[PDB]
Amino acid sequence: TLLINQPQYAWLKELGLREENEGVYNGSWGGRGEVITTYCPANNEPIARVRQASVADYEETVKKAREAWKIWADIPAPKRGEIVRQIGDALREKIQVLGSLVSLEMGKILVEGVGEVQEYVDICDYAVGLSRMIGGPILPSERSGHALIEQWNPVGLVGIITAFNFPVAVYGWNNAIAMICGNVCLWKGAPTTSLISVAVTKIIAKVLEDNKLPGAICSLTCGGADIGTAMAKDERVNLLSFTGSTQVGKQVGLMVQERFGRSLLELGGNNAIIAFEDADLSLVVPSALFAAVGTAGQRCTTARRLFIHESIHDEVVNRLKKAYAQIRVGNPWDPNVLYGPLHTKQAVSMFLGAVEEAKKEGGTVVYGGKVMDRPGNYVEPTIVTGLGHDASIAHTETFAPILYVFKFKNEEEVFAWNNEVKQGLSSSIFTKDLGRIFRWLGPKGSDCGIVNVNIPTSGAEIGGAFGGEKHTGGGRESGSDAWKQYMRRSTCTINYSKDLPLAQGIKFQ
Amino acid sequence: TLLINQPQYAWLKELGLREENEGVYNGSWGGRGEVITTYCPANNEPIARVRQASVADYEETVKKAREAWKIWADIPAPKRGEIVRQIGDALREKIQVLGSLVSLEMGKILVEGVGEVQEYVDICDYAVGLSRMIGGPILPSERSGHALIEQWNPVGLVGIITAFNFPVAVYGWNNAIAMICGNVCLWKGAPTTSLISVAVTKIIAKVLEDNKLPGAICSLTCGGADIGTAMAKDERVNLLSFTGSTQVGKQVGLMVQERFGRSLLELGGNNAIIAFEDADLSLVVPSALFAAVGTAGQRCTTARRLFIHESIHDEVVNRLKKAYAQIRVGNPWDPNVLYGPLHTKQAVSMFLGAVEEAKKEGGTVVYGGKVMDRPGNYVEPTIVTGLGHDASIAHTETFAPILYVFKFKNEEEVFAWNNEVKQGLSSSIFTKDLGRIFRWLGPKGSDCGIVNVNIPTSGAEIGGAFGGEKHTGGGRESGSDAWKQYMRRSTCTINYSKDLPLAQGIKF
Amino acid sequence: TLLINQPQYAWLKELGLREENEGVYNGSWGGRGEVITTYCPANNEPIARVRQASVADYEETVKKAREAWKIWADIPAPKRGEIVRQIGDALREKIQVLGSLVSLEMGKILVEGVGEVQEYVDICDYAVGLSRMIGGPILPSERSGHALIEQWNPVGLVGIITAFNFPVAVYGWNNAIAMICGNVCLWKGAPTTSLISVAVTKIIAKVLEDNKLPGAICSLTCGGADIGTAMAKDERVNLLSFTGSTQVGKQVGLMVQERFGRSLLELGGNNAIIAFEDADLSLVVPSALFAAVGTAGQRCTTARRLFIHESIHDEVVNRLKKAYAQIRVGNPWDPNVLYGPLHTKQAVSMFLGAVEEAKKEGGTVVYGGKVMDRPGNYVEPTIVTGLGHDASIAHTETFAPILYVFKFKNEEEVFAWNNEVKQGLSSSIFTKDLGRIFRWLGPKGSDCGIVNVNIPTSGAEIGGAFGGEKHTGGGRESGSDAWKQYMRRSTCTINYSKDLPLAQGIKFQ
Amino acid sequence: STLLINQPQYAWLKELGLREENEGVYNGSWGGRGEVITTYCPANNEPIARVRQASVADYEETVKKAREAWKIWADIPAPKRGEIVRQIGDALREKIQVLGSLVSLEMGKILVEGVGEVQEYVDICDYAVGLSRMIGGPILPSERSGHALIEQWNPVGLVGIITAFNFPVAVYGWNNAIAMICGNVCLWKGAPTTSLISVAVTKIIAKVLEDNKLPGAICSLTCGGADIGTAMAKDERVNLLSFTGSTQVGKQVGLMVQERFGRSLLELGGNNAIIAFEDADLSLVVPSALFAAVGTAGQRCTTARRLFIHESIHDEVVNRLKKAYAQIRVGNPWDPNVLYGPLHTKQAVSMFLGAVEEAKKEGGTVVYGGKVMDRPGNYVEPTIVTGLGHDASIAHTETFAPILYVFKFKNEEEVFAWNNEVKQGLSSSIFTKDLGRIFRWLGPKGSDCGIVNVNIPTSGAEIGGAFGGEKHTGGGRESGSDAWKQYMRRSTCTINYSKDLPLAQGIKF
Numbered sequence A, C: 001t002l003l004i005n006q007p008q009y010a011w012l013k014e015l016g017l018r019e020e021n022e023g024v025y026n027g028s029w030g031g032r033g034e035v036i037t038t039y040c041p042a043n044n045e046p047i048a049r050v051r052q053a054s055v056a057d058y059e060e061t062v063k064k065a066r067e068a069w070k071i072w073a074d075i076p077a078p079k080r081g082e083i084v085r086q087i088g089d090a091l092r093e094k095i096q097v098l099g100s101l102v103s104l105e106m107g108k109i110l111v112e113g114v115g116e117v118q119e120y121v122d123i124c125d126y127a128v129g130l131s132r133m134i135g136g137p138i139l140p141s142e143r144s145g146h147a148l149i150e151q152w153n154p155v156g157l158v159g160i161i162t163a164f165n166f167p168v169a170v171y172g173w174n175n176a177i178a179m180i181c182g183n184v185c186l187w188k189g190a191p192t193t194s195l196i197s198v199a200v201t202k203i204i205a206k207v208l209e210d211n212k213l214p215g216a217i218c219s220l221t222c223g224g225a226d227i228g229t230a231m232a233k234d235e236r237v238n239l240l241s242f243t244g245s246t247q248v249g250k251q252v253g254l255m256v257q258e259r260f261g262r263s264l265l266e267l268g269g270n271n272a273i274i275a276f277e278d279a280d281l282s283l284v285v286p287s288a289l290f291a292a293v294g295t296a297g298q299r300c301t302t303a304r305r306l307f308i309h310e311s312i313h314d315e316v317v318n319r320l321k322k323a324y325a326q327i328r329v330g331n332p333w334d335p336n337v338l339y340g341p342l343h344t345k346q347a348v349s350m351f352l353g354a355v356e357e358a359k360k361e362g363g364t365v366v367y368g369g370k371v372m373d374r375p376g377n378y379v380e381p382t383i384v385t386g387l388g389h390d391a392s393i394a395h396t397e398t399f400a401p402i403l404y405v406f407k408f409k410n411e412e413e414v415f416a417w418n419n420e421v422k423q424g425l426s427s428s429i430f431t432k433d434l435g436r437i438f439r440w441l442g443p444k445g446s447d448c449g450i451v452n453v454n455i456p457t458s459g460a461e462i463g464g465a466f467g468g469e470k471h472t473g474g475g476r477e478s479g480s481d482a483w484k485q486y487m488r489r490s491t492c493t494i495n496y497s498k499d500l501p502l503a504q505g506i507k508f509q
Numbered sequence B: 001t002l003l004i005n006q007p008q009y010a011w012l013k014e015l016g017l018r019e020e021n022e023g024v025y026n027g028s029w030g031g032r033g034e035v036i037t038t039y040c041p042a043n044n045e046p047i048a049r050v051r052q053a054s055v056a057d058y059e060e061t062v063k064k065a066r067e068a069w070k071i072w073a074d075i076p077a078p079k080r081g082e083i084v085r086q087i088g089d090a091l092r093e094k095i096q097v098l099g100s101l102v103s104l105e106m107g108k109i110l111v112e113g114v115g116e117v118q119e120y121v122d123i124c125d126y127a128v129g130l131s132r133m134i135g136g137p138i139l140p141s142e143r144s145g146h147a148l149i150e151q152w153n154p155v156g157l158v159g160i161i162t163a164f165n166f167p168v169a170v171y172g173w174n175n176a177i178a179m180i181c182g183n184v185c186l187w188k189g190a191p192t193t194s195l196i197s198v199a200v201t202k203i204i205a206k207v208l209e210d211n212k213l214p215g216a217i218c219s220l221t222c223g224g225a226d227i228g229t230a231m232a233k234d235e236r237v238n239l240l241s242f243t244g245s246t247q248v249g250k251q252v253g254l255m256v257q258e259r260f261g262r263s264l265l266e267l268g269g270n271n272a273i274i275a276f277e278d279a280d281l282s283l284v285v286p287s288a289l290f291a292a293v294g295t296a297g298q299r300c301t302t303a304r305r306l307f308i309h310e311s312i313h314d315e316v317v318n319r320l321k322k323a324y325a326q327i328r329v330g331n332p333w334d335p336n337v338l339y340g341p342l343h344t345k346q347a348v349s350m351f352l353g354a355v356e357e358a359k360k361e362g363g364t365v366v367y368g369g370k371v372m373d374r375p376g377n378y379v380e381p382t383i384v385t386g387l388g389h390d391a392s393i394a395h396t397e398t399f400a401p402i403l404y405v406f407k408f409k410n411e412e413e414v415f416a417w418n419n420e421v422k423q424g425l426s427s428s429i430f431t432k433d434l435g436r437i438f439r440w441l442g443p444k445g446s447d448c449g450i451v452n453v454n455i456p457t458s459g460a461e462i463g464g465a466f467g468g469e470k471h472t473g474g475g476r477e478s479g480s481d482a483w484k485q486y487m488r489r490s491t492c493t494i495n496y497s498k499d500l501p502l503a504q505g506i507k508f
Numbered sequence D: 001s002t003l004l005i006n007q008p009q010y011a012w013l014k015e016l017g018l019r020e021e022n023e024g025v026y027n028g029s030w031g032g033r034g035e036v037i038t039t040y041c042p043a044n045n046e047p048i049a050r051v052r053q054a055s056v057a058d059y060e061e062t063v064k065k066a067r068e069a070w071k072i073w074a075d076i077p078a079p080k081r082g083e084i085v086r087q088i089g090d091a092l093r094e095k096i097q098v099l100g101s102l103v104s105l106e107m108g109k110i111l112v113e114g115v116g117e118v119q120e121y122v123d124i125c126d127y128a129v130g131l132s133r134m135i136g137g138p139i140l141p142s143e144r145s146g147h148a149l150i151e152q153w154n155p156v157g158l159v160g161i162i163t164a165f166n167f168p169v170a171v172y173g174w175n176n177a178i179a180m181i182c183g184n185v186c187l188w189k190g191a192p193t194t195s196l197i198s199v200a201v202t203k204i205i206a207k208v209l210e211d212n213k214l215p216g217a218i219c220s221l222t223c224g225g226a227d228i229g230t231a232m233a234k235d236e237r238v239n240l241l242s243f244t245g246s247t248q249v250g251k252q253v254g255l256m257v258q259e260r261f262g263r264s265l266l267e268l269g270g271n272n273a274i275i276a277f278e279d280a281d282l283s284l285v286v287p288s289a290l291f292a293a294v295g296t297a298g299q300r301c302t303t304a305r306r307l308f309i310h311e312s313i314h315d316e317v318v319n320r321l322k323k324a325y326a327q328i329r330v331g332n333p334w335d336p337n338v339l340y341g342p343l344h345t346k347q348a349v350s351m352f353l354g355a356v357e358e359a360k361k362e363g364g365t366v367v368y369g370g371k372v373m374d375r376p377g378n379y380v381e382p383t384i385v386t387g388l389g390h391d392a393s394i395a396h397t398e399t400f401a402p403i404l405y406v407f408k409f410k411n412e413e414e415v416f417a418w419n420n421e422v423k424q425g426l427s428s429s430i431f432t433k434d435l436g437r438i439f440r441w442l443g444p445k446g447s448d449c450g451i452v453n454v455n456i457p458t459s460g461a462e463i464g465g466a467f468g469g470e471k472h473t474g475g476g477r478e479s480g481s482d483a484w485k486q487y488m489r490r491s492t493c494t495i496n497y498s499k500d501l502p503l504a505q506g507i508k509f
Ligand SMILES: N[C@@H](CCCC(=O)O)C(=O)O
Pocket: C119, C165, C166, C298, C299, C300, C301, C302, C457, C458, C459, C460, C461
């Protein structure tokens, strides 16, 4: 009954997947823990099985990765760059079949699955460039015969914990950067996207092995909260990059702080789009559509709040309503399909709980609000009006496709309402006013890590640093100088002279 | 009985100090908390009194500072820099009396008191430069008609908690940088250096007043653990910069993380100097001396471990013993003096405890090891040989002037020994070998935040980022791009076109 | 006779000036060349005299500066910064009287004279910061046991030739930055602003001598074309910074290239302001006024061309005409005066030539166009309409207050019209349109070094690099990383190992 | 049968798309109405194939087509331009052995160097791809409320690239990869005697451009001699001219470009010294001197031409270098394990013999070599000359021949001055262990060269840093660090988002 044993899913073998797969890789493949079955959210059928990590597996893998680090850290960065380049090429080769696997096991539509892999490809190109550039400044010493320099060195082992909704790209951002920086990696992905984790690890393993490098440089330990907790408490994990819920993320941050580790937290969002009276509505409506119903509203960057100026409120809602009705629903791998299933059954229940609660708090469902009567975890993408900006149900990160719509009049109040939530990931305004754009980007504007103008809250490119503020956790990934989070800084002063002048002109003699 | 009431201490009035001083400043001066009396560690005589903050004082001050921020953050960064430039000049004007107050209340020698103020003057210079430079790159977008830019904005209120041993400079690092970045500051210093905190705050308050700015931009709430804990738990403190013990700092870090705040931790060090066989011994010996006994061994950057290659161990120890015997002890304001008192009687007690335990663990005191028979908190600077690199007593952070001396044979083992401690602040090797210096500065070398060659572990200049790794806490202050810790990064994409191309070429 | 001998002007003594002043400083004050008398352009009365350099003085000064360099380059950059900090303070103390001298000898109004000195103070503050920051990256080598670093070192002697129109600030830009970079400087200012050069050099000299530094670190050699030419041909002048006419600048650039020297050319502008239909006219009119008549139109950044969209052309010209009528003319040191004389009588003659040529090319003088009947070198600020955008006189830079006004309809053509001149210094558009601002700043927009939006062409701040493209010469001064032009880059590879791996994996064995 | 390309053993040439007669002009179309040149193999003096060069009209049409193509190319976002350069990188990767072999055949350098040269191109492509997501400038804090101050970078337009015989692939590649991601179009004129290499490289690039539906004139080719080169130097439509070649020609190129206020990047000759101090590791000194001197048969601009050895070790080093020279394997340069090939031309052989005779005429002792080799092709013995003084005239004439001049020295100060005393300033190396000395070498009183090395040869740079020299070497930089800024124009841009007009320096007008 496994999908992978059915003739139409034979393409899965192009990723090297079988009926039962090893979920631990450290140079060798294994897995002595529990076997998990993952399911297609589009039809609730079992795909294939993964043998997860046991305690012994985790312990062995950590030790092997750290031993592999002794070799990898000695390889010059541009040569490490060359490995990441080849990973980039290996992804390019598999991009359609890997994207199809993401569509099958996670449930996002094919163009987004392929697009997610493209993020990994892109950050590989960026990292290759970085491998020739990373480092610090030579600074002028105030002391004669001294050099003052900033050195950057790998932290060691980077633990990477990722979530179900971007089962490839987030690992990719971390992997590519942490690698060229001289670190080894240990991946624990979402249990419900284990096959994706295995498939990606198979691609990377072959590059490492083909370059006669130890596989444990990019290690994999599939597991649940037991493995993630072990990572958060493990002093041998020098940096823990965690992407997931705010609730879990807070505890991960506390555990890592308790051992004076380093953490990179990428947590939830409650992101807002704001449409001012002068906004190009031809930009607003498709932007809101993509930001809200993209990935069935299961992105951390998904727009969950839509603020519309009172003068254009009804008109925007009407046009958004017509747009929602023209969304093509189907199997996420099927063509021209723009809307797939939610990732889990539990998610469908929450969607129901939130829609009913929204009704109870005074809100009006102007579109959707119901489960689709069809196989899979399909719900109607939903629009709710009439609620206040401070309504409890709207201050609740539900990973459901529900968009809460609010009226506003003044710029000052609506900027405040953007900022009033606990999360601080993404935000966007739609406007032409020059001054307003300046204020939005300034000290009294958005408090988020991503601050956009005339585009959705979702769909970042890799060139900038990605992450948010407040309860979103403060970590940054991907571009700009996010690489510094994966390295340790040292301020080095070298005396090349025969004298000992002291800083600040202190005479100690 | 108060020193400030005696005529040979009348210079204290040049800093605006009196018999009883207000320890809360937020634009106005006050303090409803307990009155603390601070003592001169060189004679144990009371200097003057400071009325500390009550928790209600702190609450009012936080609110006023946040209101002031709304004004301050609207002032262009180069204009904020002009203010910091004037603080710089105001410090320059009072550098001698303020340095003398540092020597009187904290106990460090006058050249170090003055030198510490000079660090604040230096970072002011640096920050004035920064006020014209801070920002992020404009990046090329993969999308037609889009701009991709990185913006930096202030975090808001920066809480600053500092320790007794550097009562001016650490605040200064944080103040100058936080200010040009558009933040407001709230300072809680060490209770036993309250007068110094008040004196520094008076200097800054006058500059703010003269420039018609709200005083709460640089607020002061003198207090102890109750105020520090309030700051650690206060969601309105956007960034908490904490310098202090690893024990307290760990809890501070947890409290801040619990509320998803930002922290910058600057905690303890157990810093080593390593002298290889090819070392210039004429550099080794005075560097060890300065690193170990400067500030009477009370810096977080103090050399506490000295590894010496077998072949030169006895010669270096013998020369260091002769150098220690030439150290001139006395009142720290007497400018012929190189060595003053420990900051507290408690430090003396801990010193004696550590010396006794070192001996019980098999160490030999080859110099010092005893209290001095004079008023105040004086102990002999002390050298202990004979211990193994992993002796328990050498792995306890003792803020006292005891230098533990170890032998080694090979580079691999002694780099490991440098790295085996919980802290990771400063480290230094003395050698001429190129390959060794490369390895020391590389991925298999020192694991510390400060990695030096042929100089002490102490005495950084302000141009680089300052801080450590591991149990030192990971925070960075002062130079390089440390300013980024005082700001929030946003990645901003602006669509100037009439189209909506999506990232990664996705067709939706 | 001499103004410095009259009690109305006794404040000149505060700058250390006398009836006859030495125009050479190299540690000693001297001058064996011809004695020049400078005149106040407001009344054509002699101010004071200056003994200029002989070529022998020049020779001696170059040699003493290069000797001073051996000491100065050994001073750590942050300590050179402390010297520049003190120069900044010395300028602050004299800012009113030095500003007044600029007004007296050069002819610009008092607020502009003081402002020019303020630029020097600002760049001193900036330079003090730079003195702790200058240097280059440590890069990762592709080779084991190798370090790859970028070093920056002083070029040695920086010759600085400045023009009459900014007799303090341009030297200041060059001086503050060259000094912290570890260079010595040799200044030849405009002969007609000799007193200003002397006054500035006296301020700097006191700081150097008080610090027991060799005075030739900031040498002065007052003189004319003969000294300037010697500097251009002298191999011992490692960098020649030239600010002046494009005609002279080309020859200077050619003389420096012929000896493989370094040059930094800051030449003429033919700067345009463009007002679109959606422009805020309350910003346009006072911006055009300042940009056109500030410094009596004697800035290289002066607006000389004003393009106005057809719909608002007549309105703007009428409103500009009204603002011109309210300009207050008189002695520039008078605190109520808004408009002073041209710097020389030759400039009056050139003004007259250009106005008559504009009429002969078909232009209409709608305001001004006449020499004023009063002592000194005053002319009416002038507005000319009706010329074609490519009229010869409009494509000519005349250093006089003449503003040529053009009509346009579409953006593509007027962007081309901005770019069609030989010069490329400054440019400005007034508009609110988002897309148009993007294009203006982009590859098909303005070709100038300074590209402004909703402000005049003139009045840069110091934080950014200052300079232009095309016939403006290509040099950059002041902010950003302009400091690199005063230093030589070395790319340095250091082998710390016992092996010799070759770049690109070449095996030569 | 006479042409090598018509002989079966060289059939591999047709893998590069070469034939008996080739078109030497590419601008989207292939052509060439100019003189037909035949290039010869220097290893056997046999003709290889023919190339039809550009006429005047060809150059004229190509410049116009390139500048038309730029309108399309400059509008393509930098990261997408990077994707094109990435594909060029891949295409070179696939042809690297056969292209390297062609370099050995037509230019004469040995196979590992030919392949290594192509590897430099591949490496800079990887770097440029990274840069394509990074290039730009800082947002700076304005001193004025409601204003933004930013630095923009935009392409200059058409970049002319003139390259030399000795690096017929890599120099073009540095310029091409970087110029492309910066949004420029390029026009290449190579050495006539390496025309087939130019055509081969262009065929590889043209396929990538055409496959990507881009106008081929983006990377144009106009093979020709001095008439084409002079045209480019005088052509105002060439916005940036990058010239690699002799110093004498270079100065004339720089003068011509300055005369029209264009931009030039000059990469001219070197007279590079290695300095060995008494404490040097001689096991590094001897092979470094061997590679630096005899690699490329001494025909690099970075070739070590002067070897200074401390008096205490001079005889030992010379003796050891003699023995090393005798171990050099000579043969056909496209043969693997051959380490020494022919000079590029018969004229170079004559000039070699002349320089050797003059060296003896100046009192020099030939301790090794000095003679033509008894075999076909342009082979000479790599040569060592001792006994001369550092200022001997023959050691200050840049001969592209394998003659190493060896000097004695005693003191650090004198030998640093001797390094610096020549007119060129390209590369330099010291061999020492002394910390102070290395500090001094890299400092303001040390080497005056653009490349300043420690314990490695003068030649063999990696692409991560900027490449170029000082003084008569011309001042240009190519490849790494921020050399890309030479290919772009900087603008300092101020945007007023407010309704007010505060002026810089607080001027009230
Ligand atoms: N700060 C002045 C500098 C002008 C220089 C000049 O006119 O030559 C400005 O931006 O107008």
